[PDB]
A = this chain, B = another copy of it.
Amino acid sequence: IGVKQLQREIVLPGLVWTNPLTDFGGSKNDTITVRVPAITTANRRDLRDPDRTVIASELVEHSFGVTLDKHVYAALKFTDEQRTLDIRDYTKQVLMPQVSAVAYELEDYIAELIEGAPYEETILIDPADTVPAFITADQRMGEANVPTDSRRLVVGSAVAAALAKDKQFRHADWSGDQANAALREAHVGRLAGMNVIRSNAIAPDKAYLWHRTAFILAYRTPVVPEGAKAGASFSANGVALRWLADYDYSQLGDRTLLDVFTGRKVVTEVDGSFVRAVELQLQASSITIVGGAFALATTTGTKQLKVRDDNGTDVTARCTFASSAGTKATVSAAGLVTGVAAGTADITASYVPPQGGTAKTATVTVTVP
């Protein structure tokens, strides 16, 4: 009888351009200089013009650097604590958790690469009709002449739910799908030519669309040093990590380390404007506090408030909290509410919407003991 702890699902590592460059050890500053070929311009004269000079064009090639800059590792300390005092099988209770931790760290690395790109504009998704937002996203990558091949679309856990709840996909007449894959199942697969990939690594209420040649990502396995007591190479979702175990004789226990060198790059144009990927955010209209009216345990108790907007997005760190009566209870900026006197208190949560404008306010009451 064994139940596992709930953990994310790995999608991102397979959906990005990985290792197009693999000789960072052969360049100064661990930087490969990718060159971008040159395009030129033509000029128009006038026939039979007395002025018979021409304007010479130019052939300027461009370049940008890709660098290894991070070192993702998971380190475990075993102050003795082995054999009987701890893990009996040193293959499923230590190696597997360590490899999974490094894999999740790599996925978070890619996720922060994708979310942190210099998106100049965010495309709002109206929950009532979500298709126009995605068609606009497709259009924005057509105005930049991005190829239509190998184009990926990753949606959050809330955008997928909004898509399934959209009457465009839920009603079979409006979609032509006389099976209602969006009603019998909660799954909508293809829209606006883009295959949806669901993911939880990215923000819940965001979607990202990117060409393959928009996020270069490079990996490098550290070579096992000759003077290591135990050395091996593991594989986490297509990445060769180095596992290295070495005793210490002074720290009263051996240590293990599972690591890999990583680097990432957003392929920006020669102008410096990022046009090879777009982001979309699910538009929100109102917020509420989960659980409604509630009560604490003692007068000096603590409760962790949780605010959800209309489309089930956990907007807690993105909203500010105020207390009507601080003499009875107070609210932290992170949602913690603690009472200072016995009685009622009114808590107001203000969340500025992604579209901009007056912040939506949700008021709840609490009865501190």
Which among A3-11, A239-247, A311-319 touches the partner chain?
A3-11
Residue contact A1 to B21, C-beta cutoff 8 Å: yes
B7 close to A145 (CB less than 8 A): yes
Q: Does A284 contact B (CB under 8 A)?
A: no
Q: Which of A8-47 contact B (CB under 8 A)?
A: 8-9, 20-21, 30, 34, 36-37, 39, 47
Partner of A270 from B5, B8, B9 at Cβ < 8 Å = B5
Residue A269 contacts which of B6, B21, B30 (CB distance < 8 angstroms)? B6
**Interface 0/1 of A134-159, CB less than 8 Å to B:** 00000000001110000000000000
Tally of this chain's copies: 3
Contacts A1-B20, A1-B21, A21-B1: A145 and B6 contacting too (C-beta < 8 A)?
yes
Q: What secondary structure prevails in chain A residues at the interface with B?
A: loop
* Residues of B contacting A146 in the complex (Cβ-Cβ under 8 angstroms): 6
Question: In chain B, what residue has the closest Cβ to A213?
Answer: B3
CB of A225 within 8 Å of the partner chain = no
Interface residues of A (CB under 8 A from B): 1-9, 20-21, 30, 34, 36-37, 39, 47-48, 62, 144-146, 213, 216, 267, 269-270, 275-276
Q: Top 6 closest A-B pairs, CB basis?
A: A6-B145, A1-B20, A3-B213, A5-B39, A8-B145, A3-B267
